[PDB]
Amino acid sequence: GLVPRGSHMNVLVIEDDKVFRGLLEEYLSMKGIKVESAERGKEAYKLLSEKHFNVVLLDLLLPDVNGLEILKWIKERSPETEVIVITGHGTIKTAVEAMKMGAYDFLTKPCMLEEIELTINKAIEHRKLRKENELLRREKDLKEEYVFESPKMKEILEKIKKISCAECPVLITGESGVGKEVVARLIHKSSDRSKEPFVALNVASIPRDIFEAELFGYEKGAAVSSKEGFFELADGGTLFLDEIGELSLEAQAKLLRVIESGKFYRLGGRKEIEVNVRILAATNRNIKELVKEGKFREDLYYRLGVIEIEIPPLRERKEDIIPLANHFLKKFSRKYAKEVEGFTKSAQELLLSYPWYGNVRELKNVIERAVLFSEGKFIDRGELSCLV
Amino acid sequence: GLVPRGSHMNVLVIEDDKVFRGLLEEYLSMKGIKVESAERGKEAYKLLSEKHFNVVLLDLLLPDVNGLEILKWIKERSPETEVIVITGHGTIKTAVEAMKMGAYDFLTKPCMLEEIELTINKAIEHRKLRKENELLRREKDLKEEYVFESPKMKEILEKIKKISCAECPVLITGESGVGKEVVARLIHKSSDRSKEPFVALNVASIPRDIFEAELFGYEKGAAVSSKEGFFELADGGTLFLDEIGELSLEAQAKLLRVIESGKFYRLGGRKEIEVNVRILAATNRNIKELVKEGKFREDLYYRLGVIEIEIPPLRERKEDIIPLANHFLKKFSRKYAKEVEGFTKSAQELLLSYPWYGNVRELKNVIERAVLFSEGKFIDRGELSCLV
């Protein structure tokens, strides 16, 4: 209901009735919202075509226009615009129709002032949530194309297609420096919850204590106020745990319960929490050994590992090396405003013959350095020999 | 109103009236929501204490308990729980009080079936938006502590404190490989919109065409459907453009208009868009030269550069080198499950004397490689000599 001082939410009030229109403009204005109004549909069409509005209050009983037609027009051209429709006490079902057509809520005319305020409040709130929701998602989408032409990565793609199971966990393994998050995303994209969020957690970059608190949440004590876990927040979606080797035994036990029952408790809590989260797990480690050393639960390992995607190292996928290296060269050449356009023939042969024990991470790091110190259009073998 | 098939949203209906309680449970159930109910407040207290509920429908006129007390209790212990209160036609102001106390919406008893459905729909929607909103934000928070003990970085911190201007742009400059996003975040944190979102865009990692479309959005044509820009979505918040040197002249012109008027148009649009977005800009380039070469607008450069934070290179902040290197060693040692705990004395002297022309990025890359190929508890000079 309340907007930040430094925000410019634009609201249009379309209402032929002077008194009611005034009430609407007054409250919106009291709330620091930028308000404009129209008395007629024709006037509204013009305003809407020349200025974008974030929320619209729409009378469905205008004198010279059919309100639903404005709603329909707004939603096909500007679905980002939230519409609250204003109806009479007589016509309720027209309000229902409006909802079907994409309206957010409705106001019955007349009503109590408090009803108006509350309706407007929740409409403003809704817009802000949708805006921020879209912002954060698109910020993510921009931070992620995968280049893998090798036959082994292609067959991995084929294996991913074969996964028809919706909730079954998947384990993704590979040497240190091998990218496993790309594969996890591909699984998510092909899954039946592809339109639900995908959350990546780097288990190895967050200290344990804070990680378990973040993952499962906690209740007051053990630590001032309640904090829901990523598991609760990821309900309906997919949670990718980058390095499960870094889970404490206690976290592993909770994880298995989530996978098998969907029910668990926050840290030091007594409230059952119930979620449906699809687990994708990765590790650059030997879990089989960790189990034998008592550092990892056998039952969790079996559960995660039923479906396992083994990503082979770069040296076993030599077809991917040049495409990756060229991608990184292009990326960093632009970042650092360098002239370099490619690798010499001699340089490429060196890239292909090097084992890349660090795999893609090492490759990326080597190229970034080469690009940083490059001169002219090419990186030659000598510039890599030092590095690799 | 509709939840995904693979989600476990838990809803509690607290209602003494058999008929109305039934109507509520019926609809929630038809929608595939996991429903439970209580006829009395005491019963409700027990259910709520033993199982977490995501949404609660709360009768405010229970026979043996005061509804507002349940609301108050829920909101102090479990504000994550959305509460829709059920009231009588007589008591409206008690509903208003409930809203003040944190209730999301209210239902008047009795009402039309369609009213119930719509109220429940928007409550479910609200929960999902809040959940995903919290998920995405906390995913971000987890991906970001800055270590800078050098006097020059300290005085930069002091300069950041002096910025009392709320909307004024800031330009952050420094050599290639110097981290400018940390400084941009610190400015945001100290700003008067610190509680609003902070959005980072890597201008140099997104191809131009798609970047301008993403930033300013577009209207139908020029490209099927309307897409609002990051500028609209970042309204009320702070937008950090990592490398402004990579903006086309057309994008620069639009950017200046946003900064000065807050009004602009999407690509090929005729709707005025009005936002209040605080611009933080960074570049590892010589904008002064780009202006002279006609590749950058003079007026935009002047505007962005009024307040400028110049981050000096690592070699000029030698006090930051070991803390950074130790941070990266710790980080990557855990990532790759290595034994290494620190650098030898000889290794540290090499780190301190090296110019770090790539600065922090180069440092990070060198340490990652050293850690990857390390053996035992230490990295010695010889392991770096090769690299640096």
Automatic annotation (TrEMBL), chains A, B:
Sites where the protein binds Mg(2+) 2: 181, 242
UniProt KW keywords: Activator, ATP-binding, Cytoplasm, DNA-binding, Metal-binding, Nucleotide-binding, Phosphoprotein, Transcription, Transcription regulation, Two-component regulatory system
GO cellular component, one term: cytoplasm
Binding site for ADP 2: 147, 177-182, 361
Domain Sigma-54 factor interaction as annotated: residue spans: 146-372
Domain Response regulatory: 10-124
Binding site residues for ADP 4: 147, 177, 179-182, 361
4-aspartylphosphate carried by residues: 59
PANTHER family recorded: SIGMA L-DEPENDENT TRANSCRIPTIONAL REGULATOR YPLP-RELATED, TRANSCRIPTIONAL REGULATORY PROTEIN
Protein name per UniProt: Transcriptional regulator (NtrC family)
Organism: Aquifex aeolicus (strain VF5)
